[PDB]
A paper describes a structure:
[name] is a 15-kDa inner membrane protein subunit of the Tol-Pal complex in Gram-negative bacteria, and its function is poorly understood. Tol-Pal is recruited to cell division sites where it is involved in maintaining the integrity of the outer membrane. [name] is related to MotB, the peptidoglycan (PG)-binding stator protein from the flagellum, suggesting it might serve a similar role in Tol-Pal. TolQ, [name], and TolA are IM proteins that are coupled to the pmf through a conserved proton-conducting path, which is also found in MotA/MotB, ExbB/ExbD, and AglR/AglS.
The final refined structure included residues 37–141, 161 solvent molecules, and 3 sodium ions. The monomer is composed of an N-terminal β-strand (β1 residues 41–47) and short α-helix (α1 residues 51–58) followed by a five-stranded mixed β-sheet (β2 residues 64–68; β3 residues 74–78; β4 residues 81–85; β5 residues 106–112, and β6 residues 133–139) sandwiched against two α-helices, α2 (residues 88–102) and α3 (residues 116–130). Close examination of [name] packing in the crystal revealed the presence of an intertwined dimer where the N-terminal β-strand of one subunit (β1) formed an anti-parallel β-sheet with the C terminus of a symmetry-related molecule (β6). The [name](36–142) dimer interface is formed by residues from three regions as follows: the N terminus of the protein (residues 38–53 and 55), which includes β1 and part of α1; residues from the central regions of the protein that include β5 and α3 (residues 106, 108–118, 120–121, 124, and 127–128), and C-terminal β6 (residues 132–141). In contrast, >2200 Å2 of accessible surface area is buried at the dimer interface of [name](36–142), involving 44 residues from each monomer stabilized by 34 direct hydrogen bonds and 2 salt bridges. Truncated [name] ([name](60–133)) bound PG but [name](36–142) did not. Hence, this form of the stator protein likely represents the closed state of the pore, close to the membrane surface.
Author numbering:
A (entry chain A), B (entry chain A): 37 to 141
Amino acid sequence: PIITQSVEVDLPDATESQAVSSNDNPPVIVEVSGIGQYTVVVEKDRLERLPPEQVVAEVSSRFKANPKTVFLIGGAKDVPYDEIIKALNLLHSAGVKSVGLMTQP
Amino acid sequence: PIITQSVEVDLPDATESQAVSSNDNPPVIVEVSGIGQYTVVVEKDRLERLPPEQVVAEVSSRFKANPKTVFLIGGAKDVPYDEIIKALNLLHSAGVKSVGLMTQP
Ligand code: NA
Ligand code: NA
Ligand code: NA
Ligand code: NA
Ligand code: NA
Ligand code: NA
């Protein structure tokens, strides 16, 4: 106590929906809720309860296979800010350069 | 019901602390807590309880005066994800291209 989190982001004019609609492949969705706990979803395939290092492995694998892959962070409206910063840092550590942020029911 | 929020972000290698430390001027901090309610802080000067359109006016004014200005979004660890997406969209609408995200006590 107390550790704070930070991340720098750039804001492009291109949109989250544009990224998804213009891509040949489904997006890879990193869903957050669970303190440092993630579900990775690609279409119907769900990889639940993954710890940070396993999310890095999964995401880095997909980015290497196709760097054009669209990555999204999904979560309920009330997911804590600190968890969102952690997730952005996690994705950047795995090599991801662009992310769509979206809230979900 | 139900409106969701989204924003696309790019992840540069440059950091939030780097942006602040390398700048000649203090950062402009948009603090969030309050549903669509913001405090804009520059050094000791606080502009509290600003509605979205007033934040846009204040931020756009500072960006026009100096486009090298460092903009930050500050908030407690538990600020809701949806409010963070709203704040990023608000800043981008005012012309801001880079933002540092940081949690605070
Ligand atoms: Na960063
Ligand atoms: Na793997
Ligand atoms: Na997280
Ligand atoms: Na966007
Ligand atoms: Na003004
Ligand atoms: Na907000």
